[PDB]
Structure formats: structure tokens, C-alpha cells
Amino acid sequence: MFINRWLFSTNHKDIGTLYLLFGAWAGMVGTALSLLIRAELGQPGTLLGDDQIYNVVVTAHAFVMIFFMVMPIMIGGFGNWLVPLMIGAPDMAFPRMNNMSFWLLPPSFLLLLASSMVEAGAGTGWTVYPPLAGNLAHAGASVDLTIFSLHLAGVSSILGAINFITTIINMKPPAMSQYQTPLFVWSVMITAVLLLLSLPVLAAGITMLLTDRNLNTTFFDPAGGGDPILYQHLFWFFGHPEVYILILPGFGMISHIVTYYSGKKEPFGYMGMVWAMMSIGFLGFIVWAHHMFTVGMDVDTRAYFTSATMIIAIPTGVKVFSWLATLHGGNIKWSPAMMWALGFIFLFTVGGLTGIVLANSSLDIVLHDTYYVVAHFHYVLSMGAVFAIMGGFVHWFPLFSGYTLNDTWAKIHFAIMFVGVNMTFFPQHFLGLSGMPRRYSDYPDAYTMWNTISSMGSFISLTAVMLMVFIIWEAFASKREVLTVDLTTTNLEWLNGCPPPYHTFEEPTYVNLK
Amino acid sequence: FENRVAEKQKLFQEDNGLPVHLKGGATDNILYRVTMTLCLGGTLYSLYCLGWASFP
Amino acid sequence: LTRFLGPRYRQLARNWVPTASLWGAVGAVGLVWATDWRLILDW
Amino acid sequence: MTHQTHAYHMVNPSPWPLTGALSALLMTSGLTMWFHFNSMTLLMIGLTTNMLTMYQWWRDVIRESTFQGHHTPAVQKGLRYGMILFIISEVLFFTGFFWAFYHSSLAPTPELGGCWPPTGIHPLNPLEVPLLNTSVLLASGVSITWAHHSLMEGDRKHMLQALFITITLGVYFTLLQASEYYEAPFTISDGVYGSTFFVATGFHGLHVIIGSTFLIVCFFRQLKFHFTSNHHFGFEAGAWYWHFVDVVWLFLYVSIYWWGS
Amino acid sequence: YQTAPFDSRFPNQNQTRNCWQNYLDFHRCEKAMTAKGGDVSVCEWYRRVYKSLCPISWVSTWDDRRAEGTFPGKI
Amino acid sequence: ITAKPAKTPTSPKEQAIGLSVTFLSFLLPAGWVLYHLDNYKKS
Amino acid sequence: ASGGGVPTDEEQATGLEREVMLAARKGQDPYNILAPKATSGTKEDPNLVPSITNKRIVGCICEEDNSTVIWFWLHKGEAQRCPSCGTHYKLVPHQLAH
Amino acid sequence: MAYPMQLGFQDATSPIMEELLHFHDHTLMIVFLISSLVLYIISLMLTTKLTHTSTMDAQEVETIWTILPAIILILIALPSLRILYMMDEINNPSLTVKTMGHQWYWSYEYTDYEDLSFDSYMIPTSELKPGELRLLEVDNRVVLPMEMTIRMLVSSEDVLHSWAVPSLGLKTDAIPGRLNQTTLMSSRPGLYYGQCSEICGSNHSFMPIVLELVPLKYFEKWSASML
Amino acid sequence: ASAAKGDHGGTGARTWRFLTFGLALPSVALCTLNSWLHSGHRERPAFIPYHHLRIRTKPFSWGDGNHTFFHNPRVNPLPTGYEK
Amino acid sequence: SHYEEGPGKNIPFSVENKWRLLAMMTLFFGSGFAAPFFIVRHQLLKK
Ligand code: HEA
Ligand code: HEA
Ligand SMILES: [Cu+2]
Ligand SMILES: [Cu+2]
Ligand SMILES: [Cu+2]
Ligand SMILES: [Mg+2]
Ligand SMILES: [Zn+2]
């Protein structure tokens, strides 16, 4: 019974719930790791020890938050939960395969946990670049385990990418065109395509790294005629699409949240919005090298990559401005989710603006490998991707559970986290302009002030993720059942009540062919 | 040759309230349990090895 | 040989494994006392 | 409600995803044992449960489609998409390896002798067996097509005959390639040339074996009358995969065997 | 001579080949002036350049390779 | 979004309890390990 | 060439596959594979929404190029109207279901 | 070097670093414009009881907000690219120094004439003489002539490392088997600090760079007394 | 190096079966002969301890950890030199 | 499908007793947050 339901599932709703549960827990581990990082940097000196134990921590932080919290939650959680409901499908195209996608995750996570236990773990950076990641500077099972964890997580994500594209394309009502599906669905259909094309190149890269250190190959070893830079190309070819794969579903949720709380029927410029994500997804494939400005490449190619990278601002701009245009004549409701949506719009703008700066190779020479880049991506990840997750979570919680959250508490939670993340990452812009490198367990005396303030902010964030856990408990402890939902005419996900039954759309949906 | 898909269609369409991976008999069941056993055991064995390798 | 094999027989085999499975465990226990493996003793 | 009125398939709870996920764990960690604490028992168990899972997972799929009739037109169109997409991810997997190769051969490091093929490497002759392997794969391309056409025309014997010829050519290539490996005057350990060569042609080799067991499966399904002149996706896929395989060999031949040697 | 001057055939951030080429060139010229005599003329220019640009360790190992005859370049 | 009153309301005391517990469960284990860092760094 | 031997759908198709196969040749569509064609939608010529129960979700693409489908439950009883454009829809019992 | 409570870039010791400061100011001016524009529009949208929830025509305004960002990007790109080429410019150096990253120290090689080569290691915070910088002082500074175009060639003898000196606006990764080139040109004497800008193991944070720039005369006497 | 040839506008199974036995298979036979004729056994290449070859940074997970998988002693030397 | 439906029933954990739930959530998120701390400890106690 429990087994059949929870271990042998073929239900998009239950698999989606299983994901959210996996993502939340992984989110705890990643938070703990981020605290050890700021604990180590909150006072001049060494708390843990050498850059090895420290960088092992920094590496797990990245893998956990990227592959085990953000991706599972947005794509597996909201993806599986909402997609079928938004297009009127009974389930997904491949219910069984969908389950394997999920179950591949816990093992993948185990391998990553195991890696930091055996030997001295993997202090290579999330980019696990060779020669440091090689069998000399990093002998032992650790890196190998890190590689296998990544293989599984990749197999999991492209299998799911296959499911979402097939479902989304093949399972909509016969009269509904693609230009009739909601932005969130478009958002995951496009993210699914990026995963399908980038993930395999990564697997090609790390498999080459695996043979280099166990089978005596020399793909990245100069001795045999290899090239450590070749790994950089392969990794980053996936590495960039990967960050868009991380923000796109967030773009979608934001479009849904802003529109709903503005009391609007639809988002402003729907086709412009579809065009924008498609452009973003595409340009995202031809700019990888901006991560290699100080590697010794030709000035000309270095010029190409700074330009190519900059044009991504245009489409992203039409999206920011569209969400604003959406708020326009709206009847605004200051709900928790709307608060998260507004924060995202601003904070993400700042963080992406800061990324345009780094787009310049000349300036990037002095900005690369410093805390400026740590600020850039935490703005777009800690107050971009994450803010979307929170807005979507508080907005759809009633649909998933049937129960409601205490809005006041939910608002308190935003206030605390908003202060925390800004205090944590704002100072870091300075540390980076002033020269503080990345991946250091200690720094020259001058960087003491900002690092201190920065670490204090991380403690406020800790407070907020603790409160959230409680906020979820209370919701489930009180049991206020949902009664009425607004704007369902334009929001299908809610039409079957909270929570929708195990089997929805048993009998299709009627859509006329005008 | 044969052609008896018609017999199997009937066997598998039979309303015995059994899941497809068991709808076919007793062997389905032994195969299932063997597979399940090896997997769980293996998983246990793997955890042991990791606990073992964690130490110097 | 061929006669013994049958589509119908499977339930008996499944039942046999448990009794057989239970029987198998006893031998390990029985052998172990006589065998006295230090590792077995350690277990 | 109660009785569905959509043409889709609601698959029964299967333990297979869990079983195959556990399998991946066992094989990956098992490789880690083999590579480090010199043990294969774990790797052996994983390979085992894995075959078990694939057999059963695919057995059920056959049950649900051929015996139970769940593969309505809508369900099939979805399987077509899935296969295409899968083949795509594969095309991009091989692309990492051609990138690697071209990267190395187009800009040979001084430690190689500043040339390509590196000094000390004696490349095979494309005009010898590589040329043979090429013609074998290409012929199975025409014969698998003949098979497909017989099937649609309900010609049982001929489809079987063509599918058989196709399968043996695939095996012939496997053996031929196997001998080439053994006679090759260079190894995986011979710098970047050997790496580049053995892993690209090697992964492809694995794919020819994966494609051949697939066609074999198709062969037997046909012996058992599973396929109708009009519904035989299992074959369509086997066929698409088989072509992906010739094509990859054409690039290998031209790039590694001819140009980069 | 101050230091190896700018070389048009090696105009980018990567000078690896610059070091490599001149090391070859020198030793190739050397071998010839030897096996020809021609008043044992000498190609110093190449050595000045390769010594400036090539890190010691490379030159060393290459020399050793040339010693045991495992040097991959054609001289 | 409207909802029925709580089927099983959580009074302030009840909340104060759940909030305290939630905090401790996060702060204790970490605090302990962190409290003994030096002992580890000195074996 | 020459010969025969492979089964046909008409003779070997089973389950739901067969059901839609036959149903399709009679011109009917019980498993909603096709897009329902609209009526004039007037109070007198409502769009007839077949259903296997007493309510079905109707999605109304008000104007041809609309990107937003208006959704709502159509109940057994008097004709109902799309909230954004009138357009009458009336539930009807679903015949063929096998 | 960096001082306490610093906000922006370290003071430019060389001309391209000056050039960068000005470009950054330009770029930063724009990010301030846009980021404040967005914030104003947002607060504007959320501050009225007036509603208009019916349909709104897009596209029309959609050109303004697509052509504008396009013009602004050129305004950044142009200056950026110019400085970019200016860096990879045809110059003729009067000296060539090599540096080789090693697992936890850099070694330098001045070999134009004589085979001079030494190791540069960080001074343990324990053996620092009063007034010496905690994690920045090295035992052997890399001495070079001020006011002269030097050609640095960066490589490594093990894992990847990155040789950087912010005041001069330099940063070049050190990749084994590779010779990356960079032009150093200080326009003023002094001590200029930098740090390894690439994760390389346990002591990644403890392998600094200290440039000491004196006049040619003192440079050559130093060079000789060094062997 | 060809261009193309004999068009037979109607392609059914008979056409593909025709190409199989009238083109595909005959080619496999020719090339087989060709490769059976050019079967010149190359004398094992001269051994010279080049450093970019016979790489060994970690002993192989099998045998004496110094023998590559499809090791052919006749044509593959160990790092030290030919097997025997 | 004998799968129960409705609030509190579409989840793999019991939500019927708020305090048993409290315990479960506490162990769940708690064990997740503590893991990194104990891993660092483990690494600090090796040689
Ligand atoms: C979801 C996460 C995310 C997102 C969306 C982005 C978006 C962008 N990032 Fe990225 N970035 C990261 C996460 C992300 N990044 C990470 C993880 C790293 C570090 C990885 C590592 O090395 O470890 C990184 C690193 C990184 C680098 C290299 C730094 C270095 O190591 O030297 C660069 C440089 O090009 C860069 C640029 C950009 C750009 C141009 C965008 C653009 O998408 C920004 C677009 C947004 C806007 C431009 C604002 C909105 C638009 C307007 C308001 C229009 C008007 C504005 C203008 C005309 C400018 N990023
Ligand atoms: C998803 C991406 C993500 C997120 C969200 C964060 C969040 C945090 N990270 Fe970051 N970090 C990375 C990804 C992420 N990080 C990456 C890729 C690197 C590069 C590593 C490398 O250099 O190799 C990095 C590097 C990095 C550094 C640089 C270390 C160095 O280079 O020396 C620092 C230091 O401050 C740091 C700190 C933090 C902090 C303080 C938080 C805090 O903001 C955390 C706040 C807590 C949360 C926001 C999580 C709460 C959310 C949930 C738990 C979801 C709950 C679930 C439900 C509601 C269902 N991170
Ligand atoms: Cu990028
Ligand atoms: Cu370093
Ligand atoms: Cu370093
Ligand atoms: Mg770097
Ligand atoms: Zn309507």
C-alpha cells in the first residue's frame, strides 16, 4: 500500500511531492554548508583548517544547492505537479520513467555524501577542473564518487527532460495550440530542451576525466598531449545553459504569480514573453567561453564572446519590462507570494546587471576569480531562483496540500530573508572590486570588515529558513481547509479543488475548435 | 510457426486485479522477489563498503 | 524432466522458497557452530 | 470519471524504476570498488539487477502494448517523440568526443612532437579493415530497410530473412572491430591519440552491441507474431537506433580513421 | 639583444609554440652547421630567443629527451 | 483564497512550543559539533 | 519477392487500441482524440458537451488567436455560458464507452 | 594593495588599469541608471488605486524597450572592446620574465642573458616583522624596472594557478604545458601585491605575489647579486 | 568516386531486396577479398621509450596493473620495452 | 484505486497528530541540517 503508492508510483502528483520533499531536505544540507563557509570567513584566521577541508565544503555547497535543491524543486516538484494540471492531461507521457528520474536522485546524493567522507573529500570547486581533480593532486575515490553522482543526476534530468517535452507537445487538448499553453508550461518545455542538449556534453567531459584518472588516458594531461583547457570548454558548454536551466522555470512562476496577484487575466505581451525565453535559451548556448577570459585565448574570439554574451540582455529586458507592464492597471494584492515576486524582479535585475559588467573580457580580467562574481550569482540564485521557489511554494501550497499557511507569519519570513540575503551578498561586491579572491579560507587583514558583516547576514538567513520549517508545521497542525479560490477561469490548476484528486482529467476537457 | 498472441492477450486482459508485472504467473513473482532481494542486499553491502572506506 | 516443468507450478515454488529459505538459514546456523569462523564469531 | 475517456495509458505501479535506480547505485559505486579497492562483486551484482530490471520493464511494456492493447495512436505518437529525443541526447554525447578529437588533432602539443599523428604512433590503414567495417555497416542499412518494407507488406518470411542478414552484419562488424583492437599497434595508454581513438570508437562499439541485441529482440518478437503490418514501433525504433549507429561510424571513419591518421 | 622581440607568426596570448619553434630551429641549424662544417658557423639567434621564452624545465627535459633519443620533435 | 477555520487550532502556547523545538533541533547539533571544534583539531 | 504472414490490426488489435479503431471507422470518437467542432453557440444552438458524468470542464478560446483559454465546469442542466463571451454550452450524456 | 573598508578598485599603478577604472565608472553609471529606473517604475505601478485590468496592447511599447537596451549595449561594448585590443597590443618589451606556479609558491626566471631563478614563498604570519602584511608578504620579491615594458610569461609546473596583480590590472592563469603571455608596465615605483587567483589545493590562499619596482640601475645590480 | 546511377522509380520490398543482394552484399564480398588480399602482416614497430606513449599514472584495475586490456605482445610493448 | 484522497492524505507522512508530526519534521529537517557538521567533524578526526 504505502510501498505501492510511494515507492512504486506512476502519479505525477505523488512523484512531484516526492521531489519537493527531496529538495527541501537537500536544502537543509546546503544551508548548513553555506554556514560553515561564512563561519570560516567571519573572523580573520582559520576555523576549520586548510583550503582542502574548506573547499570540500564550498564544493558540496554548490552541488547540493544546484543539483539537489533548485533543480529537483522547480522541475521535478513544480514541473510534475503543475504541468499536467495546466494543460489538462491525465498524467505524463511516461509515468514509470518519471519515477526512475526521481529515484535516481537519492542514490546520486549518497555518492556525493560518500565522496566527502572517504579520504579527504573533493576540494576541487564545483567545476572539478583538472589537474587539481586528477589522480595525482586528488588521488582516491572522492572525485570519482563526485563524478558518478553527477552521472546519475544527469541521467535523471535528461530522462525527465524527455518526459516533459513529450507530454507538453503530445498531450494538450486537440484544439489547443502551443501558443495557448501558459508561460510556466512553456518555461519548462524550453528548460527541458536545454537539459537535453547540455547535459550529455557534461557527461562526455566528466567521463573523459574519469578515464584520465583510472584508465591512463590523457585527454586533459599535457604529458600525453592533452589539454586542461579542453575540459573547460566541455564543462562550460554545459555550465552556462545550466544556469538558464536554473532560472527559466523561475521566470515562468514569476509570470504566473505577478499576473494572479495583479488580478489580471493574462500576462502582458504573452508572445513577447515566449519569444524572450526562446531567445534566452538559444543565446545561452553560444556564450560558454565568457567563463574563460583569463585562460589565454585569442583577442578576437575573446571579443566575440563578450558581445554574444551581451545581447542576452535584450530579451531578458523584454521580460522584466513585461512583468512591470503586467502590474500596471492591476488590482494588487499584497500577499506573501507577491512580495517574493517583486523582490525577484528587482534583485534579479541587479544581479543580472552586475553580470553584464562581467560580460566584458577587459574588465573581467581584474574581476574574474574574485568575490564580485560570487555576488553576481548569489543575487541571481539566492534572490532570483530562490525567491521564485518561495513565491511559487507559498502561492501553490494550498493546491498541493489543501491547507492554508498563516499569511502574517509568511510575511515575517519574507522580511527576515530579504534583510539576510542583502546583508550577506551586498558587501561582497566591494571585497571583489578590492581584490579578495574566491575559494580562500582566509584573507588579508583589510577584507575583515565586509567579511564580518557578510557572515552576520548569513545568520539572519539561517533564522529565516528555521522559521519557514515551523511555518509549514503550523499550517499542517492547524488544518484550515481551502474553500474558495479566485480567478480560476484563467488558472486551470485550481479547477479540481485543493488538493486535486489522485486522478484528474479521467474524462478529458472540452475545447472547441473555432 | 505458432501465433498465439491471442492466448496471451486473454491471459493479460483477465480481470484478476493483478498488476502487469505479476499478471503472468508464478515466475513473475519469483523473478520479482529475486530482483528485489539482490537490489536491497546489494544496497546494504554498498553502505557497508562506504562506512568501511570512510576510515583511514 | 520436461514433464515436471509447467506454467501452473510457481505458487508451490514460491512457497517452497520460504520453507526452503527458512531451511537454508538453519544450515548456516548449524554449520557455523561447527565451523567457528572468527568472523562468524565476530558477527 | 471511474472509466477514462482519453486515449492515454495509466501505467500500473511498477517496482522497476526503484530497482533500476538501485542498479545505477550498485554499478557506479561498484566501479568505484573495482577502480580503487580492487573488487568486482559489487559491480557484478549491479550488472545483474540491471539486466533483470531491463528485461522485466521491457517485458511489461510488451505486455501492455501487444497483449493488453494500451498503445492507442496517441500513445504511439508519444513514443516516437521519446525515441527521437533520446537519439538526440546521444548525438550530443558523441559530440563531446569529436570535440575532444578535433581539439587535439588540429592543435598538436609539442609533447607529441608538434604534429599529428604524434610521433611514435602507427595509425591503421583506412583502406584496409576500416573500409570493410564501413561497407558492412552500410549494407545492414539497406537490408534493415528491406526488412521494414517486407513487414509493412506483411511478408513474414522476408522480414525475418532481412532482419537476420542485418543482425549478422552487425555481429560481423563487432568481431572485425574486436580483432582490430587486438591487432592495433597502439593502446588506450598511448597518449591522446590512443585516448581519443579507443573511447570514441569504443563507445560506438558498445552502441553496435546495444543496437544488435535490440534487433535480436525484434527478431524474436516477430517469430512470435507480435508485429502487425501497421503497428510495430519496437521495430521502427530499433531501426532508427541502427541508423544512428551507421551515421556515427561514418563520422568516426572520416574523422579519426582517415583525416586524423 | 635585449629580449626576444615581437613575432608576427606568434601574435597571441599563447606563446607555447614560440618557445617550441625556436628550440627546434636552433638545434636543427646546429646539427646542420656541424654536418657541413661550413666553417662551423653558428645559429645563436635562435638560442637567445628560446632561452628567454622557454621556461628552464622545458629546455632541460627536452635536452634530456634529445640525449636518450626520446625527443618527439624532428631535428 | 478563503478557508474554513482550523479543524485543530494551534494556540499561541502550542506555537511557542513548536517554534522553540524547531529552533533547537537546528541549533543544538550544530552548536555541539562547533563547540568542540578545537578538540577535533587537536585530536 | 512474394508471400505473406503478418497479422493486421483489424485482426490482431485488442484492448482500447481496438476500441478506438472501430469507433473511429463508425465516424464516432469516444476517447476524445479529435477536436470538437463549434456550433453557432446561440441560446438555441448551444455547443453540445458530451460527458460521462454530470459536469465537465469546458475551455473556451473566445477569439481565434487568443492565447488565453477560459476554463469552467459545465454542469448537467440548462445551457451555460462562457464567462467572457456568452457562448452557450450544454451537457449531454456520453454514449459509447467500452 | 587593499586597505581597510575599501569599496572600489585598488589604485591604478599602470595605464590600462587606469583605463579600466574609467570604463568601470562608465559601465557602473549605466547600471545605476537602469537599476534605479526599474525600482522607480515598480514603486510607481504599486502606488495607485486606479485600475485597468482589461486587455492592454503590447508590441507598441515593446519596440521602445527593445531598441533602447540595444543602443545602451553599444555604448558599453565600444569602450570595452577598444580597451580589450589595447591590452593585446603590438608592443616591444625590453625584458622577459617567466613565472611558474607551483603547489604553494611561485618561482621566477629572468633568463634573457644569465640563468637567474628564485623561489617566492609567503612569509608565515608568525615570522613577520612589524609593519609587514599578514598574508601578503613573500620572502623573495620579484624585482623589476619601473617605467619599462616587461613581458611576463605565465605557466605552471603542476595544477592550475593564476598569477594576478590587481594594481597593474593583470591576471593570467598558469596552465601546465602552456606559456601564457602578458605585458607588465608600471608607471611608478613601489611594492605591488597580488594573490593566486585559481583554486590549487590546501594552501591556495597562502601563495601571494609581490612586485617591487625600482629604477633600472638598482634592478641590474639586484639581478647580479642574485646570481 | 561516383555520382549515382540506374533509377527504378518504384521502390517496394522487392527493390530493397534487390539492392541488398545486388549491391550491398556484393560490396561486402569485394572489400572482404580486398582486405583478405592486403593482409600484409606489419613487423612489430621499433621500440623507443617515448614519454608521450605507454602512459601510466595509475596501474590498470586488472592483471599486473601494467597491461592494457586488448594487449597484443607481438605489437604492443610494455613501458620498459616489448614483452618477449 | 484504494488510495485515500483529500487534505492530509496525499502525503507520505501522517498529519493527524500535530506533535507526532512535530517530531517527524524535526528529525527530517534536523538530520539534514546536522549532516554537514558531523562530516566536517569526521574529517577533522582522521589520521
Ligand atoms: C540563474 C543564474 C544566473 C543567471 C540568470 C546569470 C546571468 C548572467 N550571467 Fe552569470 N553567473 C552565474 C549565474 C547566473 N548568471 C554563476 C553560477 C556564475 C559563476 C560560475 C562559476 O564560475 O563558478 C556566473 C558567472 C558569470 C560570468 C563569468 C565571471 C568570471 O568568473 O569571470 C559572466 C561573464 O560573462 C556572467 C554573466 C552573466 C550575464 C551576462 C547574465 C545575463 O543573463 C544577465 C541578464 C539580465 C539583465 C541584463 C538585467 C535585466 C535586463 C534589463 C533590465 C534590460 C536593460 C539592461 C541593459 C541594457 C544592460 N556570469
Ligand atoms: C542554488 C544556488 C545557491 C544558493 C541558493 C546559495 C546560497 C548561499 N551561498 Fe552559495 N554558492 C553556490 C550556489 C548557491 N549558494 C555556488 C554554485 C557556488 C560556487 C562554488 C565554487 O566556488 O566552486 C557558491 C559559492 C559560495 C560562496 C563563495 C565561497 C568561496 O568561493 O570561497 C559563499 C560564501 O559566502 C556562498 C555562500 C552562500 C550563502 C551564504 C548562501 C545563503 O544565501 C543560503 C540561504 C539559504 C537558502 C536560500 C536556502 C533556503 C531555501 C530552501 C532550503 C528551500 C526550501 C524548500 C521548500 C520551500 C520546499 N556560496
Ligand atoms: Cu555563463
Ligand atoms: Cu595557486
Ligand atoms: Cu591557488
Ligand atoms: Mg578561474
Ligand atoms: Zn468564451
Check CB contact of A216 with chain I, cutoff 8 Å.
yes
Place of cell 607529441: D112
G8: left (phi over 0), alpha (psi -120 to 50) or beta: beta
- At G73, which helix (H) or strand (E)? strand G70-75
Closest listed residue to residue G13, CA positions, set G30, G25, G4:
G25
Separation CA A8–CA I80 (nearest Å) = 56
Q: Any alpha helices (H) in chain H, and if so which ranges?
A: 15-45, 60-87, 216-225
Q: What is the DSSP string of A258-321?
A: HHHHTT-SS-TTHHHHHHHHHHHHHHTTS-GGGG-TTS---HHHHHHHHHHHHTTHHHHHHHHH
Residue of G nearest to I17 (CA): G1
Cell of H58: 503590447
Q: What experimental approach yielded this model?
A: cryo-EM
Geometric angle at alpha carbon I36, from I35 and I37, rounded to 5°: 90
Q: Is A290 annotated as a binding residue?
A: yes
Mutate to test the interface with D, among B12, B35, B38, B52 (most CBs of D within 10 A): B35
Check CB contact of J41 with chain A, cutoff 8 Å.
no
Surface-to-core class of residue D113, CB atoms within 10 Å of its CB (0-12 exposed, 13-18 middle, 19+ buried): buried
Q: What is the DSSP string of G6-72?
A: ---HHHH--HHHHHHHHHHHTT--TT--SPPBP---STTS-EEEEESSSEEEEEE--STT-S-PEEE
Separation CA H170–CA H186 (nearest Å) = 11
User: What structural domains and CATH numbers belong to chain D?
Assistant: 1-70 (1.10.287.70), 71-261 (1.20.120.80)
Q: What are phi and psi of D101, to 5 degrees?
A: -50, -55
Q: What are phi and psi of A221, to 5 degrees?
A: -110, 110
**Which residue's alpha carbon is nearest to atom 23 within ligand 2?**
A125
* Number of compact structural domains in chain E: 1
Return all residues near H114 (Cβ < 8 A) that are at least 6 apart: H223, H227
Q: Is G85 annotated as a binding residue?
A: yes
Residue C17: give its domain's CATH number: 1.20.5.220
CB J23 within 8 A of CB A477: no
Residues in chain H: 227
* Number of compact structural domains in chain I: 1
Please give the interface size between A and G, counted as residue pairs whose CB atoms are below 8 Å apart: 87
Separation CA D199–CA D97 (nearest Å) = 8
Does J11 contact A17 at a Cβ distance shorter than 8 Å? yes
Based on DSSP, count helices (H) and strands (E) in chain F, helices before strands.
2, 0
3-state SS of chain I: helix, strand, coil percent to 5? 30, 0, 70
Per DSSP, H156 falls in state E
Neighbour count for residue H3 (Cβ, 10 Å) = 10
Q: Is the peptide bond before A84 cis (omega within 30 degrees of 0)?
A: no
- At A338, which helix (H) or strand (E)? helix A336-359
Paired strand residues for G81: G88
Cell of G92: 449531454
- At A255, which helix (H) or strand (E)? helix A228-261
Separation CA D148–CA I17 (nearest Å) = 11
Residue I18: give its domain's CATH number: 4.10.95.10
- Ligand 2 lined by A386 (C-beta under 6 Å): yes
B25: left (phi over 0), alpha (psi -120 to 50) or beta: left
Cell of B42: 546489494
Cell of H163: 598569477
CB F43 within 8 A of CB J45: yes
**Would you give the end-to-end CA distance of chain B in angstroms?**
63
CB G58 within 8 A of CB G44: no
Per DSSP, A486 falls in state S
Q: Separation of A359 CA from ligand 3 center, angstroms?
A: 9
Closest listed residue to residue D21, CA positions, set I57, A266, B36:
B36
Return all residues near C11 (Cβ < 8 A) that are at least 6 apart: B26
Ligand whose nearest atom lies closest to the CA of H158 = 4
Closest listed residue to residue A118, CA positions, set B42, B48, J37, B50:
B50
CB H161 within 8 A of CB H171: no
- At G74, which helix (H) or strand (E)? strand G70-75
CB J3 within 8 A of CB A502: yes
Residues in chain G: 98
Separation CA A441–CA H196 (nearest Å) = 13
Separation CA H179–CA H98 (nearest Å) = 9
Separation CA A225–CA D108 (nearest Å) = 7
Per DSSP, J13 falls in state S
Separation CA H202–CA H205 (nearest Å) = 8
Q: What are phi and psi of G79, to 5 degrees?
A: -55, 145
Does D99 contact A151 at a Cβ distance shorter than 8 Å? no
3-state SS of chain H: helix, strand, coil percent to 5? 35, 25, 40
Does H205 contact A346 at a Cβ distance shorter than 8 Å? no
Cell of J11: 502525503
Q: What is the DSSP string of A134-152?
A: STTTT-SHHHHHHHHHHHH
Closest listed residue to residue A448, CA positions, set A25, A136, A20, A41:
A41
Per DSSP, A446 falls in state G
**Would you give the end-to-end CA distance of chain D in angstroms?**
65
Check CB contact of H100 with chain E, cutoff 8 Å.
yes
- Ligand 1 lined by A171 (C-beta under 6 Å): no
Separation CA D186–CA D193 (nearest Å) = 9
**What distance separates the 2 farthest-apart alpha carbons in chain E?**
39
* Number of compact structural domains in chain G: 1
Based on DSSP, count helices (H) and strands (E) in chain A, helices before strands.
19, 1
Place of cell 525577484: A344
Closest listed residue to residue A98, CA positions, set A117, A120, A115, A83:
A83
Cell of H95: 625584458
Residue environment code for D49-82, b if the CB has 16+ CB neighbours within 10 A, otherwise e: bbebbeebbebbbbbbbbbbbbbbebbbbbbebb
Cell of A207: 567521463
Residues of I in contact with D135 (CB under 8 A): 27-28, 31
Paired strand residues for H116: H110
Separation CA A320–CA A317 (nearest Å) = 5
Fold of H92-227: Immunoglobulin-like (2.60.40)
Return all residues near D107 (Cβ < 8 A) that are at least 6 apart: none
Range(s) of the domain holding residue F21: 1-43
Compute the nearest-CA separation of D145 from chain B (Å): 24
**What distance separates the 2 farthest-apart alpha carbons in chain I?**
63
Residues in chain B: 56
- Ligand 2 lined by A243 (C-beta under 6 Å): no
The 3-class SS string of G13-31 reads CCHHHHHHHHHHHCCCCCC
Q: What are phi and psi of H96, to 5 degrees?
A: -135, 115
Separation CA A341–CA A42 (nearest Å) = 31
Range(s) of the domain holding residue E71: 1-75
Per DSSP, D6 falls in state S
Residue of A nearest to B52 (CA): A118
Ligand whose nearest atom lies closest to the CA of A460 = 2
Mutate to test the interface with C, among B7, B8, B30 (most CBs of C within 10 A): B30
Separation CA D113–CA D104 (nearest Å) = 13
Cell of A7: 515507492
**Would you give the end-to-end CA distance of chain A in angstroms?**
45
Domain limits, chain H: 2-91, 92-227
Q: Separation of H213 CA from ligand 4 center, angstroms?
A: 23
I43: left (phi over 0), alpha (psi -120 to 50) or beta: beta
Separation CA D74–CA A465 (nearest Å) = 45
What single-letter amino acid sits at A434? Answer: S
Cell of A138: 586528488
Return all residues near G4 (Cβ < 8 A) that are at least 6 apart: D154, D155, D156
Residues in chain C: 43
Neighbour count for residue A101 (Cβ, 10 Å) = 26
Separation CA D207–CA D201 (nearest Å) = 10
Separation CA D135–CA E13 (nearest Å) = 46
D29 vs B21, B41, B46: nearest CB: B46
SS3 A50: coil
Separation CA A178–CA A174 (nearest Å) = 11
Range(s) of the domain holding residue C22: 1-43
User: What structural domains and CATH numbers belong to chain B?
Assistant: 1-56 (4.10.91.10)
CATH no. for H2-91: 1.10.287.90
Separation CA A30–CA A458 (nearest Å) = 13
Residue environment code for A457-483, b if the CB has 16+ CB neighbours within 10 A, otherwise e: bbebbbbbbbbbbbbbbbbbbbbbbbe
Separation CA J33–CA A501 (nearest Å) = 33
- Ligand 1 lined by A342 (C-beta under 6 Å): no
Handedness of CA C19, C22, C26, C32 (dihedral sign): positive
* Number of compact structural domains in chain F: 1
**Which residue's alpha carbon is nearest to atom 32 within ligand 2?**
A439
Separation CA A433–CA H8 (nearest Å) = 5
CB D256 within 8 A of CB D100: no
Return all residues near H108 (Cβ < 8 A) that are at least 6 apart: H97, H98, H99, H100, H117, H118, H120, H142
CATH no. for J2-47: 4.10.49.10
Neighbour count for residue H64 (Cβ, 10 Å) = 10
Separation CA F31–CA F35 (nearest Å) = 6
CB A110 within 8 A of CB B54: no
SS3 D223: helix
Separation CA A98–CA E35 (nearest Å) = 73
Closest listed residue to residue H149, CA positions, set H183, H181, H172, H182:
H183
Give this entry's resolution in angstroms. Answer: 5.4
Range(s) of the domain holding residue I59: 1-84
Domain A2-514 has CATH 1.25.50.10: no
Q: What are phi and psi of A158, to 5 degrees?
A: -85, -20
Separation CA D138–CA I20 (nearest Å) = 10
Residue E16: give its domain's CATH number: 1.10.10.140
The 3-class SS string of chain E reads CCCCCCCCCCCCCECHHHHHHHHHHHHHHHHHHHCCCCCCCCCHHHHHHHHHHCCHHHHHHHHHHHHHCCCCCCC
SS3 H164: strand
Tell which one of A126, A287, A291 to mutate to probe ligand 1, the residue whose CB is within 8 A of the most ligand atoms.
Answer: A291
Compute the nearest-CA separation of B3 from chain J (Å): 35
**Which residue's alpha carbon is nearest to atom 7 within ligand 1?**
A352
Cell of A401: 496540500
Separation CA D203–CA I71 (nearest Å) = 19
Place of cell 579578495: A436
CB H117 within 8 A of CB H59: no
**What distance separates the 2 farthest-apart alpha carbons in chain F?**
59
Place of cell 596583480: H165
Q: Is the peptide bond before D110 cis (omega within 30 degrees of 0)?
A: no
Does E24 contact D111 at a Cβ distance shorter than 8 Å? no
Residue of E nearest to D117 (CA): E72
Residues of A designated as active site: 61, 91, 126, 156-157, 240, 242, 244, 255, 290-291, 316, 319, 438
Handedness of CA H201, H202, H205, H209 (dihedral sign): negative
- Ligand 1 lined by A235 (C-beta under 6 Å): no
CB E50 within 8 A of CB E27: no
Cα Rg of chain G, angstroms: 19
Range(s) of the domain holding residue G8: 1-98
